[PDB]
Amino acid sequence: SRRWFHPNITGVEAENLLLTRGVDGSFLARPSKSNPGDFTLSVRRNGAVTHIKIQNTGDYYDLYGGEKFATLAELVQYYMEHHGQLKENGDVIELKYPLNCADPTSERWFHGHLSGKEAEKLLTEKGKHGSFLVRESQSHPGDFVLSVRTGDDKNDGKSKVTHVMIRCQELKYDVGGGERFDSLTDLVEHYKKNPMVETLGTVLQLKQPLNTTRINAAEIESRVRELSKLQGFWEEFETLQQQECKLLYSRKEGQRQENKNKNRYKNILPFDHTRVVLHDGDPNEPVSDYINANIIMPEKKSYIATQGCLQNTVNDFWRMVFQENSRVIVMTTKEVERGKSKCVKYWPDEYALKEYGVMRVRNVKESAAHDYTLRELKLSKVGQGNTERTVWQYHFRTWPDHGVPSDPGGVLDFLEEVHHKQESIMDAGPVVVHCSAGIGRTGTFIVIDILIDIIREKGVDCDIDVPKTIQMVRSQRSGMVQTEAQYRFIYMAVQHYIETL
Ligand SMILES: Cc1nc(N2CCC3(CC2)CO[C@@H](C)[C@H]3N)c(CO)nc1-c1cccc(Cl)c1Cl
Ligand SMILES: [Cl-]
Ligand SMILES: [Cl-]
């Protein structure tokens, strides 16, 4: 249900599409290809088309005149279910009818200009039973080919590849008989639910798109070069974004009245099924189990991804650090950037001692490095001296105000140190990573950390799959990794880490 995003459409084409193929209440979203992180929400209303700017510098989607969101799907879901909220001169703009895109570019199974010879090799060397892909036809421009692998996954002739010709006849697609579809996606979805059966009984099951993003770590440099050609990075990122509609999990607790002002941004909320639940709260507080934070479990180190504190959640943050036995905190922003508070100070001045509700914190020592400041903190519960433990706060301070670092070396040396600290502490809990809304830079640091932990343990003899890792983390907190710039930065960091092995 993300067909309303059109990756290769212009503003002219958007307007004409809404005016000729849509009605009042129709809408679509689209990127500004030249300006990264810029998107447009185009809506038809009163026979005219309004364009609404959406900006993402790396922390969240900022909708002009509206609110801030973790994903465009969560944005669209919000206004398709909360009417009268989106306003112009202040007139209400209704999102009623998604205008579905027919472009297959961002589909996981679509490989564009790929030859039949390449498609078979890939299916043979990387596929399994039910792996499939769609490519543009080499013989007849405008047509396509669906290639499917079937067989026994236990070479020896037990598996095969079957090619199915897809013709384009008067702007519709068909496999030679039966229904004619308005797009390749409709055709593929139809034959995923109703599989073609070959003469003699082979069921051409479309089980999963061919995995082409999982590569050996030594292949990363070549992949980055391919993805960098003028850009394969953009197509792969928007293919990942297309799948964000699978991740609209419930966030009911963060929407409760008692919890609304515990959120930095009211619509950027933790999934219920992975949120950190706080116990032992004040019995006189009706709802005391809430913080805008999620456990991120790789699927040996786990993380808590959370926002920068508010004045009224500092105490809850320390309750969380204590309860989860966290010993390492990563801050991803300065306290203040561009004159705006990005991470309120929740620790004492150096050598000072403060109580934060029932928790007591001493700042033992601060140490300055080039890219970050280390603060050695001692955390304990008031009245229970034997509960004291040291919490090492790594405050990354040189991330640019917009975009990403030009070189990943600083981030990598930082994560390397954080990793060694965590590993030195027996039975340490999850590493807390936070600031801002806790999804952009936070997701980027966490995904880099997960990937380099693989390489650190296994060296060059391991498979890396960047979008699979990101999708896995985004299923535990909304919108982890916000921008294509961060996406490329993750690749560049992995590549750099491998080179310095
Ligand atoms: C992001 C991604 N990209 C893939 N590629 C690369 C980009 C193309 C399609 C195939 C190739 O050509 C482009 C025009 C484009 N259509 C594949 C295939 O394995 N998977 C994923 C993936 C992986 C794990 C989790 C999730 Cl959620 C996803 Cl979406
Ligand atoms: Cl596969
Ligand atoms: Cl962040």
Side-chain angles (χ1 to χ4, degrees):
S1 298
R2 210 180 178 264
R3 307 275 295 273
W4 42 262
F5 192 85
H6 298 234
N8 295 310
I9 205 176
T10 79
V12 206
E13 300 177 339
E15 283 189 5
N16 295 340
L17 210 51
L18 291 172
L19 286 180
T20 67
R21 304 293 304 270
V23 305
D24 288 348
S26 289
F27 71 88
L28 57 85
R30 58 195 176 88
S32 186
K33 292 277 222 63
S34 59
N35 305 335
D38 271 10
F39 307 81
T40 306
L41 175 57
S42 306
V43 190
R44 172 165 171 174
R45 188 176 59 89
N46 290 325
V49 174
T50 309
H51 304 277
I52 310 181
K53 184 190 180 75
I54 306 170
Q55 183 177 357
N56 193 325
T57 58
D59 309 318
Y60 44 71
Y61 293 87
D62 186 359
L63 173 70
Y64 171 81
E67 282 151 13
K68 294 157 193 291
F69 295 88
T71 74
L72 291 182
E74 295 189 354
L75 187 152
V76 170
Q77 181 182 243
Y78 174 81
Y79 293 113
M80 283 191 77
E81 298 173 344
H82 291 84
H83 305 69
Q85 291 303 320
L86 190 54
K87 294 176 177 182
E88 288 273 9
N89 67 277
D91 297 325
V92 297
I93 299 179
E94 293 278 5
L95 301 193
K96 307 181 79 156
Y97 308 108
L99 205 144
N100 300 329
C101 104
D103 188 342
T105 297
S106 63
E107 300 285 352
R108 188 170 183 176
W109 39 259
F110 184 69
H111 291 258
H113 274 308
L114 182 71
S115 52
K117 47 207 178 56
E118 290 169 325
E120 296 181 7
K121 177 185 171 182
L122 288 168
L123 284 169
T124 304
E125 296 177 349
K126 298 178 170 187
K128 57 189 184 185
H129 171 77
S131 302
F132 73 98
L133 61 88
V134 178
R135 49 186 188 88
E136 295 167 348
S137 172
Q138 66 293 349
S139 315
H140 323 277
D143 288 2
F144 297 86
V145 181
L146 169 66
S147 313
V148 198
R149 170 167 174 162
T150 56
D152 197 337
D153 292 319
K154 302 162 194 175
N155 199 275
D156 54 3
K158 287 187 173 60
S159 301
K160 63 178 168 185
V161 164
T162 304
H163 306 275
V164 179
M165 314 291 284
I166 299 173
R167 295 185 65 182
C168 177
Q169 316 188 61
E170 304 298 315
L171 301 181
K172 288 189 176 59
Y173 302 101
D174 67 85
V175 297
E179 296 302 309
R180 292 177 58 236
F181 303 92
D182 286 320
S183 66
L184 284 181
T185 298
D186 287 350
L187 186 154
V188 165
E189 287 301 308
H190 182 270
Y191 291 111
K192 278 164 55 182
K193 285 172 293 172
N194 305 88
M196 298 170 293
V197 182
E198 284 202 313
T199 169
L200 285 168
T202 293
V203 175
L204 291 186
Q205 175 190 1
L206 312 179
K207 204 186 189 70
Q208 62 278 320
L210 182 65
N211 187 336
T212 61
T213 54
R214 174 184 64 199
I215 63 184
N216 176 267
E219 290 171 346
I220 286 279
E221 182 175 49
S222 302
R223 185 48 61 89
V224 169
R225 191 184 318 114
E226 299 288 344
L227 292 170
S228 302
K229 291 175 185 176
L230 307 177
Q231 209 155 351
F233 271 121
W234 174 86
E235 292 185 343
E236 179 176 303
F237 182 63
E238 289 306 324
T239 297
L240 175 59
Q241 299 294 79
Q242 189 191 98
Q243 297 301 316
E244 79 187 8
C245 50
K246 303 303 207 316
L247 307 182
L248 296 165
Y249 304 122
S250 71
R251 311 162 288 128
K252 302 183 180 179
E253 293 299 320
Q255 293 161 331
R256 296 178 58 185
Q257 177 60 222
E258 302 92 351
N259 290 336
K260 288 187 189 298
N261 291 346
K262 298 168 190 174
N263 302 308
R264 181 173 183 86
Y265 303 109
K266 66 185 205 190
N267 306 311
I268 296 183
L269 301 176
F271 295 134
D272 297 325
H273 70 289
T274 56
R275 72 181 183 102
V276 177
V277 178
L278 302 178
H279 306 109
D280 301 317
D282 182 10
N284 295 330
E285 191 177 4
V287 179
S288 64
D289 73 343
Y290 181 81
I291 182 166
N292 192 316
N294 295 90
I295 301 290
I296 313 296
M297 290 282 329
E299 267 284 2
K300 313 183 91 299
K301 167 203 305 156
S302 64
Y303 317 81
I304 288 163
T306 188
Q307 55 174 32
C309 297
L310 310 165
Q311 287 292 142
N312 62 304
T313 67
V314 168
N315 292 358
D316 295 326
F317 180 91
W318 284 113
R319 290 169 59 203
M320 180 186 68
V321 172
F322 188 83
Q323 170 184 289
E324 303 293 322
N325 197 35
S326 299
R327 307 303 178 88
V328 180
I329 298 167
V330 164
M331 294 176 55
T332 68
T333 75
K334 292 187 189 76
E335 289 171 51
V336 176
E337 298 183 1
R338 296 294 178 84
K340 164 174 177 284
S341 176
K342 307 268 285 188
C343 221
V344 322
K345 181 152 176 299
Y346 59 90
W347 62 91
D349 298 351
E350 189 180 29
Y351 308 129
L353 177 77
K354 293 193 59 168
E355 303 186 351
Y356 300 101
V358 306
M359 296 299 160
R360 170 181 290 147
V361 179
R362 182 178 301 279
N363 182 341
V364 175
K365 191 71 192 79
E366 309 193 351
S367 315
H370 186 246
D371 285 307
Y372 68 92
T373 298
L374 172 61
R375 306 196 183 82
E376 172 178 352
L377 310 173
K378 285 183 187 340
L379 165 65
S380 63
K381 177 176 298 186
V382 302
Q384 295 178 39
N386 216 28
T387 66
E388 184 181 43
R389 83 287 315 284
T390 299
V391 181
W392 303 89
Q393 185 199 51
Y394 287 88
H395 187 178
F396 198 83
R397 297 199 75 262
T398 62
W399 195 281
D401 294 339
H402 289 343
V404 302
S406 60
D407 181 74
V411 164
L412 289 163
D413 300 342
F414 177 86
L415 289 175
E416 197 69 21
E417 183 67 18
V418 172
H419 174 80
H420 281 71
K421 180 68 69 175
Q422 172 76 2
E423 200 185 355
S424 74
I425 302 173
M426 183 66 66
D427 293 319
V431 176
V432 173
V433 188
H434 89 302
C435 282
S436 190
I439 58 178
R441 299 178 197 183
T442 288
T444 302
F445 275 94
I446 287 176
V447 171
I448 294 175
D449 197 63
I450 292 167
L451 298 170
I452 66 173
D453 195 11
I454 300 173
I455 306 169
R456 195 185 296 104
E457 179 181 0
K458 291 190 174 189
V460 85
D461 298 328
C462 67
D463 286 338
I464 298 289
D465 191 337
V466 170
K468 180 184 183 180
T469 300
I470 297 185
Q471 187 74 345
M472 182 265 304
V473 173
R474 297 181 166 175
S475 76
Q476 301 175 74
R477 181 164 174 86
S478 304
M480 299 281 275
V481 186
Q482 283 285 289
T483 65
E484 188 196 334
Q486 292 163 353
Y487 194 75
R488 301 193 305 276
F489 185 73
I490 296 170
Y491 266 101
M492 299 300 295
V494 171
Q495 174 189 224
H496 194 284
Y497 189 81
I498 295 159
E499 288 187 5
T500 60
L501 284 186

